[PDB]
Design a protein around this motif. Sequence first.
Motif, PDB file in Angstrom:
ATOM      1  N   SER A 172      37.344  37.777  33.966  1.00  0.00           N
ATOM      2  CA  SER A 172      36.707  36.802  34.847  1.00  0.00           C
ATOM      3  C   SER A 172      35.189  36.861  34.729  1.00  0.00           C
ATOM      4  O   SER A 172      34.528  35.816  34.648  1.00  0.00           O
ATOM      5  CB  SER A 172      37.139  37.040  36.292  1.00  0.00           C
ATOM      6  OG  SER A 172      36.530  38.205  36.818  1.00  0.00           O
ATOM      7  N   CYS A 190      33.576  33.349  33.337  1.00  0.00           N
ATOM      8  CA  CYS A 190      33.317  32.451  34.460  1.00  0.00           C
ATOM      9  C   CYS A 190      32.107  31.555  34.215  1.00  0.00           C
ATOM     10  O   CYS A 190      32.156  30.358  34.523  1.00  0.00           O
ATOM     11  CB  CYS A 190      33.131  33.250  35.746  1.00  0.00           C
ATOM     12  SG  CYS A 190      32.647  32.217  37.140  1.00  0.00           S
ATOM     13  N   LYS A 233      40.460  31.173  33.710  1.00  0.00           N
ATOM     14  CA  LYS A 233      40.226  30.148  34.717  1.00  0.00           C
ATOM     15  C   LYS A 233      40.996  30.424  36.003  1.00  0.00           C
ATOM     16  O   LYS A 233      41.035  29.564  36.889  1.00  0.00           O
ATOM     17  CB  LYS A 233      40.594  28.770  34.163  1.00  0.00           C
ATOM     18  CG  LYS A 233      42.029  28.661  33.680  1.00  0.00           C
ATOM     19  CD  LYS A 233      42.202  27.497  32.719  1.00  0.00           C
ATOM     20  CE  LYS A 233      41.426  27.726  31.431  1.00  0.00           C
ATOM     21  NZ  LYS A 233      41.870  28.957  30.724  1.00  0.00           N
ATOM     22  N   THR A 234      41.605  31.598  36.118  1.00  0.00           N
ATOM     23  CA  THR A 234      42.387  31.943  37.300  1.00  0.00           C
ATOM     24  C   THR A 234      41.449  32.248  38.466  1.00  0.00           C
ATOM     25  O   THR A 234      40.450  32.951  38.277  1.00  0.00           O
ATOM     26  CB  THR A 234      43.279  33.149  36.986  1.00  0.00           C
ATOM     27  OG1 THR A 234      44.202  32.800  35.948  1.00  0.00           O
ATOM     28  CG2 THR A 234      44.065  33.605  38.210  1.00  0.00           C
ATOM     29  N   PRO A 235      41.712  31.719  39.663  1.00  0.00           N
ATOM     30  CA  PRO A 235      40.874  32.049  40.822  1.00  0.00           C
ATOM     31  C   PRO A 235      41.012  33.507  41.234  1.00  0.00           C
ATOM     32  O   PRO A 235      41.967  34.202  40.881  1.00  0.00           O
ATOM     33  CB  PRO A 235      41.397  31.115  41.919  1.00  0.00           C
ATOM     34  CG  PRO A 235      42.077  30.009  41.189  1.00  0.00           C
ATOM     35  CD  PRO A 235      42.667  30.640  39.967  1.00  0.00           C
ATOM     36  N   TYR A 236      40.023  33.963  42.008  1.00  0.00           N
ATOM     37  CA  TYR A 236      39.921  35.382  42.335  1.00  0.00           C
ATOM     38  C   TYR A 236      40.941  35.812  43.380  1.00  0.00           C
ATOM     39  O   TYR A 236      41.389  36.963  43.364  1.00  0.00           O
ATOM     40  CB  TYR A 236      38.509  35.705  42.822  1.00  0.00           C
ATOM     41  CG  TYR A 236      37.545  36.099  41.726  1.00  0.00           C
ATOM     42  CD1 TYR A 236      37.601  37.362  41.147  1.00  0.00           C
ATOM     43  CD2 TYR A 236      36.573  35.213  41.279  1.00  0.00           C
ATOM     44  CE1 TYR A 236      36.719  37.729  40.146  1.00  0.00           C
ATOM     45  CE2 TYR A 236      35.687  35.572  40.278  1.00  0.00           C
ATOM     46  CZ  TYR A 236      35.765  36.831  39.717  1.00  0.00           C
ATOM     47  OH  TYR A 236      34.885  37.192  38.723  1.00  0.00           O
TER      48      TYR A 236
END
Lengths: 152, 30, 98, 153, 36, 308, 261
Positions: free
Chosen positions: D22, D26, D70-73
């Motif tokens: 990430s 990001c 692209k995965t959210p936190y």
Amino acid sequence: ELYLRSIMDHANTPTSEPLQSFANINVVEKKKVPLVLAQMDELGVPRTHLSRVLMDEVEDSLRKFQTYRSRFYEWGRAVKQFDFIEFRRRNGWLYDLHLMKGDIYYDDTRGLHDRSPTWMNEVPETRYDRLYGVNHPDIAKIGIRRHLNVEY
Amino acid sequence: RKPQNQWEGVYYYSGITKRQRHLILLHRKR
Amino acid sequence: RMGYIPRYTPWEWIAIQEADQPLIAEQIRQDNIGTSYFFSLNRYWRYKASPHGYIRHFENEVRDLLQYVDGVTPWKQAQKIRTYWEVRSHHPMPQFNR
Amino acid sequence: GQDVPKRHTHFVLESRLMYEKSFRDCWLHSVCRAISQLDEPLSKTVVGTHQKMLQRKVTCFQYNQYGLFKTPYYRLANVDRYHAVQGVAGTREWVPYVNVSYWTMNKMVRGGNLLVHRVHYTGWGTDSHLKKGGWEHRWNKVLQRNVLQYSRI
Amino acid sequence: MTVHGTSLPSTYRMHKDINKAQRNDRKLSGNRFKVL
Amino acid sequence: YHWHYNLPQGMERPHSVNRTFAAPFQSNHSLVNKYRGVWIEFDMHPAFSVALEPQLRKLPRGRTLPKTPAEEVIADYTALAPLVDDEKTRDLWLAKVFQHCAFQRCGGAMELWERYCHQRFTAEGATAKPPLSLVKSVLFYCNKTDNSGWRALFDRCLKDGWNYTPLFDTAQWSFMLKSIGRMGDEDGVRAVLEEMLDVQADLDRVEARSVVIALNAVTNADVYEFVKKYLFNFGERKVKFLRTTYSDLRGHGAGKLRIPLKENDNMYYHVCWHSSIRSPRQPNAKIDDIVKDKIEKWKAEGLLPEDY
Amino acid sequence: GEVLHNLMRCAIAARHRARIMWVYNVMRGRFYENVVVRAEVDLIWRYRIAMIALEYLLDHECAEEAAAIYSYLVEEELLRCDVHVRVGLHMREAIAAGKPITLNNDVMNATSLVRDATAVAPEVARELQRRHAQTLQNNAVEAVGAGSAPWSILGPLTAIGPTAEDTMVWLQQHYGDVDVMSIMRWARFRKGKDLMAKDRPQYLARAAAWIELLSKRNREMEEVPLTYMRKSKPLVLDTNSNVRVAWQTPLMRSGGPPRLL
RNA sequence: UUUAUUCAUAUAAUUAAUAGGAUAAUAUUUGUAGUUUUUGAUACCAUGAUAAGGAUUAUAAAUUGAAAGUGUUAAUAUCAU
């Protein structure tokens, strides 16, 4: 030349009030050397116009007390600390100092309990937990449960 | 865990070798 | 005495704790020339002034990214990517009010 | 024993690698999304067909990155390191500061490892902002300390 | 390697090698009869 | 077990460890700013430098190596140097020519030594003493082209001769031992290594590929016993690095050398034996008198019978 | 050498004396950059940098920094280096012709710089004597407060003989701590302009100022007369610790007994 | 009748260990030393929760505020060499 030689003469001076109980005390005055050299860079005094013996002592005190930011990011790695420990273990007979061998001035009668209300502000959570059987005749006064008095 | 000493300094190299001190003495003699 | 602990660390112990640890050379922060208005933010890439935080602080990095993207990508690949209405135009009833 | 089984260590290390990916991806993904999804002109210099061609080219660059994070936190921010119990962030099954579950937090309270102060379970503790406005007011106070006290330049 | 001077696979190998005689010597065949 | 929080949190005892133990700086990585070469100390007078400036332009200066071919440099020194009426200018000029021919490996530059410098330095008891910049450049030249003319010059640098060996670089001994191991001089390895030991050189900071090449050429029995006692003079970090270098230069990394090593197994096993040792663990006449009286006793007793 | 030369030129253009000494100090280098890295500045570039720095420091009356740079040029033996560059250019032309070359004393004396300096040197000596006489007269005037004092009756300079050899004698025996001929050779050019051939009193004033700056004996002979500090003893009847009985010279009070030490 | 969870039936994922780099007086160096690497003992112990009954203090109209400590029986239950 004269000021740095006075610094090196004071730093190599042994003291007798702690009687060298732990280490030599005056060596911390060599920490003044990376300051004053920077002052020379403000005074326009070239540091290459120093004698070779004084330059040896100044580089000694600089490698004892000076670090940069790039070294300060890497100087505490465990590899270097354990290499220091291993180098002290293997050959410490070569480098060791011991191996060679109201206002108070207008207060006079203090006014106590001046009706400052402690019930307007909130301090309600003053709960305390005391051990069971403080005055019980069957429970002994001395015991290992006294160790329960120190636990938070 | 066993506590680490916070009044013990970080181990860092501040010193010279015997060879470097001998070469300094030799160059100053020269 | 039998249990005396001092509330002030003695001068000898302060001197020993000071004499064991070195100084950081950038704590002197001396400055007499001025600020390098043209070069200091454009120095060598390992020691460069790296921006931090928001994307508005990344001026050169956005330029280098756009230049690299235009460099590596051919146009005959970028023709094939279509938007949503370009696909929806083949539907028999593509458009109506909400 | 001994500390935790090694499959859970592998799981926590994969979560740390997802955090590192990430941090890697990001900025690049945000710049690609902000260029490719903009309809206003980027500049006076680049307008018209050049802007649309640049948006199609950066979309082709963005889709060609196999493994872009692209995965959210908040999808995998509830991983515990000491025990294998999975909690939910936002509920009482997770504590945010030491980042363990409720079970692990209770074991580290009863073990004495942490230095935590017990307060009454229906009050607001001691924080004046927390007694004043709750979780949202302390949220806004952390925002005011972190960002809004600085005059941006 | 710093404190103990060796590593855990080498430690397991040394532990297996220091007691090789009293781990296994024979299969101890035969039959024991009751003597009283 | 712990410290209580109502106790005064003073410092118990100060620790002076960095002032009791002064450690020299030792990293596993080499110094990134070292020259890693043989320095010549070009000390020209600042009038001939301006005069010979188009000729010194094509010569190697400080950390600069021009791509001039050596046949142009020798042709410039053959014509222009007798015009210059200064002895120390021509000698420092030829030191750069020997250095330029070493980097390009032109084997014909030893004729410049016999032309100008041999008759006044190394012929029939010459009383003159050459400059240190010249002897460093020709010894760097003969080692780079594997010339056998190093031996007469190295014998002149001893304490009876020019006494130039205490002024030699650690890289000077590094390029020295690499050439002798390539040519395979067993007496040349011993005479240099005895000189490095006597002159108190940095034996630990010699190049490791230079030592394992010079040790590979040891085959004679008397010099093999010298290497056994000499190998204790290296450090423990060095002698464990010589084993990893010798195993690589005879194994997978044999392509790093220009000429491959010869199979010397008796030196490979002894270096591997010696590196494991320094690392931690992980009366014939009177005896023959006794044998003869025993056989005398067994014949008298009858244990050794005669013919039946 | 060229990067440090442009750094020194930036320091001259910025008029930053501390940065001039900083560029000179990083030009001199330490043991690390010179011996370990083997990256040191060439002698011609070192002479150029030290010469333009010494020129600026002597033009703006900075005595200590110019004294340090002059001590560096004395220690490195670079006092006759501009003559060496001129002789080297002539020898480069001669070796491009095909003639043999050498360096002697008369080869250096045959250049136009040494001949022009030796021709000018009586004018420099007369300028130095006139300027020192005016300085001594101003010192004797300011010692009283303006009439003249007996300070300027007999000064430390003797009269110049009527010979160019006597001029060289006078400059060597009254300003012999510095190399006078090298200073007069350095002071010849100013920003490329030849002052010795075009602006003669400007060149004489510049060379006299540079000689008076670099010479320590000129600094010790041009000193203002100070008042005599008298010794003192504490009082017998101690009234103050600051009030003391002063020791008076018999010049101040006539008569009385002859005193001891 | 659609959906959040539940359930059915199709699945992917697998292993082990260190390594210091500018302003430091000189080691060129790191797919190198590791191979048969660790993830392998859920039991019949004597826990603990539930309900129930006791006594002591207010002789003041002041204070923001007259409220706090101390003892016994039944049933249920007990898986750590």
